[PDB]
Each structure stands twice: as C-alpha cells, then as structure tokens.
C-alpha cells in the first residue's frame, strides 16, 4: 500500500536530503560503561550504504555489575534493539538505483530480573 | 556526495523483527513504559518512544534504589516519509530519535 500508487499512472522516486538533520543523541555521558549492564560497540562500514557506519552494541557480561564492581548473575544483561532503515546504492554506471534495507540495531543493554518457567 | 533518484522495489530484510513480547520493559531494574505515534505517510507507520518509570532502579526486594539512576537510551533512526498523491508520489528519508528503553547507571562526582 505505502509504496504502491493507483495503476492509472503510465521504480518509485527517492528525493535528496533527510527531514530533521539538525538533531543528535547525547553520546558522551559514558553510560555504556557506568551501566549495571555495560556494553561494547562495533562500527562496521559499507561504502555502498547510507549511512555507511552501522553501530551495534554487545552486552559485556551475562550478569549485571553490583556496587562492589562484581558480576551478579542472579540477573541478566539483555540487549535492547531498534528497527532502522539504510539505503543501498546498486549498480556501477549512469543507471544507478537505490534500495531501502531494514537493520536491527542493538542500541545497548538493560538489567532484567529473571523469572522461572 | 552519495546521491530525485530511482528507488528499487521491495525492502532488503523487511522480515527481521525485534522480539518485544518478553516483558523486559517491566522486569528491568530500570523499567520503562511506552508512548506510540501512528502515521500512515511514514514507514514504518508505528514509532514507539520509551520513558523511565523511576528516578532510581528497583532492587531484588522490589524497593526503589536511588544510589543509582534510570537513564533513557536513544537511537538515531531513519524512516521514509511518503509525499504527494496521485501519480507524482515521492519518498524522502526522515531522522527520528527513538528512546528504545532505560538502563541503570551508577552516578559519578
């Protein structure tokens, strides 16, 4: 429905620019490290993709970190994921096309109280 | 630097979904609740914004612990906006900050 158009019309059109560029997350509060469920990031780069960089987090621990700095396995670090779209530039010539692509991004981890089946 | 232009049919890995039926929003020590916005001219139509339910984190006993803070986790996401109607319809990328949930951080001086 979203990508269709009534057939009466004689390869859709992507317009240049991104709505609401002037917008950024606050990155540098060192939450990744100070979290009771801390996480690393891995930033893999693809030249035929926009954005080129996809930023994926991995939970550093199975448990959560207590106030003494020790791993508490009575709970789990579970990763939180968000859907985003990227654009792939296909072909190599005057006839260049663009295609949308869904990526699951692990944004970071939280600490969950485990429950019994 | 990278790029109207031809947009190919179909979305690569559309079928991938986030498992959101494991009640992590509740069982988290930094639990969060949800606000959702539906827009038919936006793909995906749903955007789901989380907000921390506590200032502190919940301990094993279920009491609020304010020695630590619940802090939201935001992601820079792209969504497509559908523009115009009839046979002159076009698509443009839009940036949306999505607060995906909350984690529990020991504070600093």
């Amino acid at each position: 429905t979203f990508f269709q158009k009534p057939e009466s019309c004689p390869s859709m059109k992507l317009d240049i620019g991104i709505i609401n560029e002037n917008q950024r997350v606050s990155m540098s509060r060192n939450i990744e490290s100070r979290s009771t469920s801390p996480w690393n990031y891995t930033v893999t780069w693809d030249p035929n993709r926009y954005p080129s960089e996809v930023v994926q987090a991995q939970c550093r621990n199975l448990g959560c970190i207590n106030a003494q700095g020790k791993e508490d396995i009575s709970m789990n670090s579970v990763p939180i994921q968000q859907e985003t779209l990227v654009v792939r530039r296909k072909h190599q010539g005057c006839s260049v096309s663009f295609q949308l692509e869904k990526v699951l991004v692990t944004v970071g981890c939280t600490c969950v109280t485990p429950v019994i089946h | 630097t990278f790029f109207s232009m031809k947009l190919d049919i179909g979305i690569i890995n559309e079928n991938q979904r986030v498992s959101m039926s494991r009640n992590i929003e509740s069982r988290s020590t930094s639990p969060w609740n949800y606000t959702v916005t539906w827009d038919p001219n936006r793909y995906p139509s749903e955007v789901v914004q989380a907000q921390c339910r506590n200032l502190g984190c919940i301990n094993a006993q279920g009491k609020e612990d304010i020695s630590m803070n619940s802090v939201p986790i935001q992601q820079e996401t792209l969504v497509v906006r559908r523009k115009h109607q009839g046979c002159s319809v076009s698509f443009q990328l839009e940036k949306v900050l999505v607060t995906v949930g909350c984690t529990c951080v020991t504070p600093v001086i």
Partner: antibody
Amino acid sequence: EVQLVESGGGLVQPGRSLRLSCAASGFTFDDYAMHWVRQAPGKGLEWVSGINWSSGGIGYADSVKGRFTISRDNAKNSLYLQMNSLRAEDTALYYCARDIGGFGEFYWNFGLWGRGTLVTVSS
Amino acid sequence: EIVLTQSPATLSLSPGERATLSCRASQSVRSYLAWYQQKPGQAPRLLIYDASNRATGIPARFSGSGSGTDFTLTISSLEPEDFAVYYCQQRSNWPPATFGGGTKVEIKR
C-alpha cells in the same frame, strides 16, 4: 561567577499560586540536576523537587506532589518551581540547590546553594 | 519512608575538643549518607558524602564514619567558626534526600 540567585518569593494567600525562579551563572547549567530544598522558620531542611539535565527525570516529595511543578530552561540557564493550592504549611525559605552528580544525573547531594527566597503563605 | 534521627539535639564543648554527632536510619542506607553544616544566615555546606568522603575545600578535622543504620560525624579539634546546625541526608531509598532533625553545636567559652 558560580552562584544561584532565586526570586518570586513574598506574600501569597492560601489557595493562590506562585512561581519561584533561579538564575544559574558561572557553570555549564545543563551538566547538572537541580533541586528546590525549603526550610520553615526555625526548622530543619526538606527536599521539595528535583529535575535532571534532560527534564526526563522529575521527582517530588509526598508533602508537595500534585500541587507543585518543577521545570528548567537550559537555554536561559534557569530553573522554575510552579507552586499551586499553597497552604500555611508551605511557608518556608526556598533554596535553589545544585546536585553534585556528573552527566546531569541525581546523586541527591547538594554542592552549590543560593541565598534563598522567602515565601509567606498568609491571608 | 526512611527516618534519620540525629542525637543529641543540642551539644556544647570548648575549642580544641572533639565533638561526636550521631545519625541513626530507621532501615539500612548502606554507605549512602552525607553531612551538611549550616552556619547562621547561610545555606547548608556539604562536609561529607557517602559516609566518609570529605567534599572539596573541607578541613581534615571534619571526618565521618558508619554503615547500615548507625553513622557518626566527628569534628576533632573544634574551632569557634564551627558553630552551626549539622544535618545528615540519605541517598539510598525512596523518597530521596530525606534529612535528619539536625544537631546544634554551641562552642563553649
């Protein structure tokens, strides 16, 4: 040069509404959680309300919930406390207090205080 | 709620002496307790945070101790400047930043 100045204090009648203000100056204001702590004449300290850098973390004391509304403005390096349905029990010196937490988060310990603004609730 | 009970209310000792102030919590606040000094016509000044850590600028004659429910501020070499009301504050559990009754220190002379 690193100080908090509050204002909007004075006489208000039971039921009517008042708004305290606090001009922060000489530090990065959006790097800190901010508090209102009050002191009834010849009495001890009472934490009223707190707000983190983002304004996503709002807290209120039971004595005050439903009636008072904290807010801030990182643009104007300023903090406000909308008080409504004011009672006699609210008569107090209201200090603008600055949290000692880094990254705009709550440590719930106060390093910088203002001179105070007196609020009398009387007919 | 958590209740902080300070004792004694009043206390009077001569310069060069050691004053021993007590804060008692209704339930454990672990190591999450602070000490403030309020001199007359002045806002409180943080002396100690998290039980035993002296704040920036605080002399070494001001030192704190305690754990769980039972805490102690100690001013060991009393000066005449040290006339004030001394408060304990908890950052362990909800509701946050609850304060003690206070303890007034009269510098005997």
